[PDB]
């Protein structure tokens, strides 16, 4: 990781993971899906 660059790989990968669609499952059989925010990316 480097600070010379515009943006650092850390915030970019974290942002891309936050942007992915997350699913939250509760079995017994509920499964919910939700889209993630892009605000970090």
């Amino acid at each position: 990781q480097y600070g010379n660059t515009g943006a650092s790989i850390g915030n970019v990968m974290i942002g891309l993971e936050e942007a992915k669609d997350t699913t939250q499952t509760k079995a017994v059989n509920e499964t919910t899906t939700t889209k993630g925010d892009y605000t970090k990316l």
């Binding site: 970019v12 942002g15 891309l16 942007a19 990316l41």
Partner: protein, 50 residues
């Protein structure tokens, strides 16, 4: 005598005053131009942008 002197001073300080017509002219000519063009790129699936 002093009377005849001050009347000759007053006579010459009483003259008519000419009057000037001052006409200014202000000219302001501006001009501007610009051309801004460029191509950007992006892929938001794996975030990569130009």
């Amino acid at each position: 005598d002093i009377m005849n002197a001050m009347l000759e001073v007053i006579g010459q300080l009483d003259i008519r005053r000419a009057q000037v017509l001052i006409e200014a002219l202000i000219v302001e000519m501006a001009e501007g131009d610009g051309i801004n063009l460029g191509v950007q790129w992006g892929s938001l699936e794996s975030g990569s942008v130009i």
